[PDB]
Design a protein around this nucleic acid. Structure first.
Ligand SMILES: Nc1ncnc2c1ncn2[C@@H]1O[C@H](CSCC[C@H](N)C(=O)O)[C@@H](O)[C@H]1O
Ligand SMILES: Nc1ncnc2c1ncn2[C@@H]1O[C@H](CSCC[C@H](N)C(=O)O)[C@@H](O)[C@H]1O
Lengths: 285, 177, 284, 187
DNA sequence: GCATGTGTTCTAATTAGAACGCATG
DNA sequence: GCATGTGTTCTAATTAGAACGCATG
């Protein structure tokens, strides 16, 4: 038989390169990882933590179908478009069709370009993520532009924070029941630095906004330290998301500049479960 | 040269269908939000697909029509081995702003052509694989007067004389009369 | 008979540099009692050493009875604030006012912690401060500690100038320094990937950022992607010899961390000075 | 601690820093008028063995300069320098003779200059008055000083006097009387 | 010579917390 | 019923920028 080949990945709206981090943690070999991103803080994180393996190609609207054909073929296409104009948390959400919402169609566009032409039964996988706190119509429109309906996976089942997120794609078993394992930190206590006491087992969804860290309407500091209450530190938010400690400690970024990056990113253990079946399709360590 | 099967979306092209020379055998879709692949596919095979933005003055986002047009056109494309010539075009009531302009051309891999009505008067930007609308040079106009044409035309209407003139060179492929 | 773990008193502990090197030398530490008041300082030591450090607050609140109770101490180390002794401050209030007088609290507690007469029990002490101080302030400190200092610049064992005076009695305190195969003597060996160094070594890093900017024309030390940049604090930790992300605690900004780093010791310098202590105490 | 008969008491040997006190020791006869006393006022370069080879000492005294302008050094300088040479003169554990020391403030040390004083001499001071003619603060291991309870005086009352000699002797020599019983008296 | 320096006190940049605001399941 | 949220604008309160300094090798 033919031997399994390293994976070739196109990642749209890469962010802090969570996808590559997950592929590496699974022993999956990666021949090329082409990222489209604009935030220089995000590119710096990925450049540093992956030593420049990532080929950054800039604004996704600069990627053309010609480029997809030349840089390909791709075995995996992943992306998570901005939701500032999509989720009902923003009273001034500009909707799917204006602002940053329409950027989703660049994903729909580039997905169509990287798909194998008809008559090419090579394995091809894609994943698209966005929130569930979106409008009912913009959920169905995305589902009708991708021609599939999403799966909602809450990081609460594998981490110490709630995170109801929608996942569109064709990943094998990406609907099988999510199961916890040795490596998952389900409790907030297991993500704190030494000497700090967790008040709760789980934290409500973490966004870019600072005081999404206090639980409830009544501003509950989630941690005791010494004679005072406290908020979650940057290092501990990384642990709640499942990143390595100090992943985002790059380029003198403030703790808020770091929370911006984390607040938009993925739950690593969730993506790990979704990617894990790919181990049987591509070369591993 | 057999007859023609053509999807019209957002605009009922039944007005100038007969007049150019072409149960009935046209399909026209209104609100595509619930259309899927199976719907377009069971509606028979087609050889051109036409979409139109609504005329100025009236409703819902101007790029909603483009994206919805794009997804249906891909649903209606044949297998690349099919011989019957396939055609398509979106046409613009000068409704899309400069930002929506580049999105439309990037999504159709072609820059538009702006037709005139000066005898200026009215104008429309249109993208299409038809090799004759790119072939045919029409009198060159501006965007300044085009932007000076919108604010006035808005303060008060599909001009398909320009459209009929546009997709006229599509009869070398299908029966007349 | 057998080697016993070391008992330490650290005054103006800062970010527990003294405990960091006793650990990295395999020296077992019975107790490490630190006097410190900056809560950012204390948090680093609390987190990075898992509550090993006994914190005792303001040094001016340390009594003799406290020293007798907490001791006996085999090692006494400290470096008192220099912001009223460093000539870099045009408003320096001197050794006898401001925070300069905090040195005498060290001289006071060192006297309290010394063993009684005829007690041959081994006992070591170390005191650090800056070289850019007054010649009269230098004269008085050596008179109060009854010994002259040794000057050591961290540039011999790191990528940063840091000329410092060291009073003490540790074995070999003025034997010369040899860069170990472990030491990172070039600025390039401390940068993160993708960055290139415009200099071999840097000038002394203070608490104000613009200390990184070198020369007299004020020059950035690093180029990244054709453009120039200052050092990152993780790079600064490497420049100082600390583990990378050592000070990444408590939502501290990069200027807050540079404040902690700018007042500390260069780790390889302290590692050398503490090297002979391995024979005096239990080492695992 | 425990006294001794008169034939065993020998003439005290004193170190006076900052303030000469010879003419304060004749009036009560701790000395001989025919010239065993050492007195330095600039003690910056005074090393330790200097003190040791100045003879063993029984009473080491220092005082801040009185209210005026002759205070060239900073006020706290006198306390630290006194504490420094104090340890130099302190005898061994098995102290045969009795050892005493005292530091005196003539209302020059401020509130936080007094706490470091009490921190460095390990006891709060005593306010010795000449009631409201004058007053001084005194640190010392003389058992009579910290025991004999003087006239009470307020801090607002001491601030004014400290500021009245600002804006502008025997009955306070009560600090030295309890050391006649330890050293020879001279007729 | 003269540049170097465990820092101040000033200006403008964030930080920041609070204040919205309601679909949706 | 109810509150939960990959957000933005803001305004007070902080924090992060540029000059002044001159013993001392
Ligand atoms: N026009 C554009 N081109 C490329 N990336 C863009 C973009 N506009 C926004 N983005 C990026 O899209 C991201 C959406 S949030 C997704 C983050 C990513 N999934 C992660 O794991 O970190 C943001 O980081 C934003 O910087
Ligand atoms: N009154 C006081 N009591 C105890 N510590 C004090 C103090 N005043 C200042 N300090 C501390 O003294 C330190 C002087 S800088 C010394 C830091 C240490 N040598 C290190 O390597 O990290 C500062 O951290 C400061 O917080």
């Amino acid at each position: 038989a033919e031997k399994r080949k390293p994976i070739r990945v196109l990642s749209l709206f890469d962010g802090i390169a969570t996808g590559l981090l997950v592929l590496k943690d699974l022993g999956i070999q990666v021949d090329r990882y082409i990222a489209s991103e604009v935030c220089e803080d995000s590119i710096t994180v990925g450049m540093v933590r992956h030593q420049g393996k990532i080929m950054y190609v800039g604004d996704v609207r600069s990627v053309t179908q010609k480029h997809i054909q030349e840089w390909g073929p791709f075995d995996l296409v992943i992306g998570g478009s901005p939701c500032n104009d999509l989720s009902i948390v923003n009273p001034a959400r500009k909707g799917l069709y204006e602002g940053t919402g329409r950027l989703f169609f660049e994903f729909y566009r580039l997905l169509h370009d990287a798909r194998p032409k008809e008559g090419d039964d090579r394995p091809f996988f894609w994943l698209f993520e966005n929130v569930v706190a979106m409008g009912v119509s913009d959920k169905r429109d995305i589902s009708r532009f991708l021609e599939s309906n999403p799966v909602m996976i809450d990081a609460k089942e594998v981490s110490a924070a709630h995170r109801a997120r929608y996942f569109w794609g064709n990943l094998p078993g990406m609907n099988r029941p999510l199961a916890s394992t040795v490596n998952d930190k389900l409790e907030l206590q297991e993500c704190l630095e030494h000497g700090r006491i967790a008040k709760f087992s789980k934290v409500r969804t973490i966004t870019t906004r600072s005081n999404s860290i206090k639980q409830g309407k009544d501003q509950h500091f989630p941690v005791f330290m010494n004679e005072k209450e406290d908020i979650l530190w940057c290092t501990e938010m990384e642990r709640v998301f499942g990143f390595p400690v100090h992943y985002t400690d790059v380029s003198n970024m403030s703790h808020l500049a770091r929370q911006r990056l984390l607040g938009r990113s993925w739950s690593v253990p969730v993506i790990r479960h979704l990617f894990a079946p790919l181990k049987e399709y591509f070369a591993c360590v | 040269r057999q007859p023609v099967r053509v999807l019209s979306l957002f605009e009922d092209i039944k007005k100038e269908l007969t007049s150019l020379g072409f149960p009935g055998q046209l399909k026209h879709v209104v609100d595509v939000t619930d259309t899927v692949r199976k719907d377009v596919e069971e509606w028979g095979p087609f050889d051109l697909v036409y979409g139109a933005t609504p005329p100025l003055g009236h409703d819902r986002p101007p790029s909603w029509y483009l994206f919805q047009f794009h997804r249906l056109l891909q649903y209606a494309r044949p297998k690349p081995g099919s011989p019957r010539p396939f055609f398509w075009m979106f046409v613009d009531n000068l409704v899309l702003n400069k930002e929506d302009l580049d999105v439309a051309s990037r999504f159709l891999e072609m820059e538009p052509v702006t037709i005139p009505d000066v005898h200026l008067q009215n104008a429309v930007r249109v993208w299409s694989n038809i090799p004759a609308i790119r072939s045919r040079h029409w009198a060159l106009v501006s965007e300044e007067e085009l932007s000076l044409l919108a604010q006035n035309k808005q303060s008060s209407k599909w001009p398909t004389k320009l459209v009929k003139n546009c997709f006229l060179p599509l009869r070398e492929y299908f029966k007349y009369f």
